Amino acid sequence: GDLVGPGCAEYAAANPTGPASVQGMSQDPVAVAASNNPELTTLTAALSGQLNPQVNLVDTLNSGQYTVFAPTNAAFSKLPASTIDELKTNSSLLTSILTYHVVAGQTSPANVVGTRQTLQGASVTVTGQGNSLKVGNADVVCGGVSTANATVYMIDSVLMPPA
């Protein structure tokens, strides 16, 4: 079959195989799974801790059917350094983001649409129909990339918990 999202298209072209693939990240847990994507490595570093040595969501993420909602390298970039340099120390304002960039439940790119709930606690206004998928105003780059026990839905915006 085929995945959902635009990037998912080009993505493959760039990373058709390997651990940074839809299948590669599968053999691995949501964590390492997203800790291979050349567009998640950034986000992961955060959750994991690489970015913030005061945070760690690798253990969590890799626990219970989740659904990564992951801010591509284009999402974070948009954000100013000051912000990033901040997430490289914070452990509450940053986590909220990460958490919000994940949903505990797991749902194909069909129902995921609508006001969902992120492991964080806030709601993630998902959207999309066919050849289009959005999330929290973001743009589902490549969604439906089920890893080991959690889905993956790359976006182009550093989703944030509205609360």
Cα–Cα distance measured from residue 18 to residue 91, given in angstroms and rounded to the nearest whole number: 32
Indicate the helix (H) or strand (E) that contains 162: none
- Count H helices and E strands in the chain, helices first: 8, 7
Q: Are 135 and 1 in contact (CB under 8 A)?
A: no
| Helix intervals (H) in the chain | 7-14, 24-27, 30-34, 41-48, 58-61, 73-78, 81-87, 93-100
| Structural domains for the chain | 1-163 (2.30.180.10)
Closest CA to 122 of 48, 78, 69, 79: 69
Planar angle of CA 111, 1, 7, nearest 5 degrees: 70
Planar angle of CA 33, 157, 71, nearest 5 degrees: 10
Cα–Cα distance measured from residue 6 to residue 156, given in angstroms and rounded to the nearest whole number: 11
Q: Are 131 and 119 in contact (CB under 8 A)?
A: no
Q: Are 91 and 128 in contact (CB under 8 A)?
A: no
HEC sequence for 73-116: HHHHHHCCHHHHHHHCCCCCHHHHHHHHCEEECCCCCCCCCEEE
115 residue type, one letter:
T
* Neighbour tally for 55: CB within 10 Å: 22
Q: For the chain, what is the radius of gyration of the CA atoms?
A: 14
Cα–Cα distance measured from residue 15 to residue 3, given in angstroms and rounded to the nearest whole number: 14
Residue numbers followed by a gap, the chain, C–N over 2.5 Å:
none
Cα–Cα distance measured from residue 47 to residue 29, given in angstroms and rounded to the nearest whole number: 14
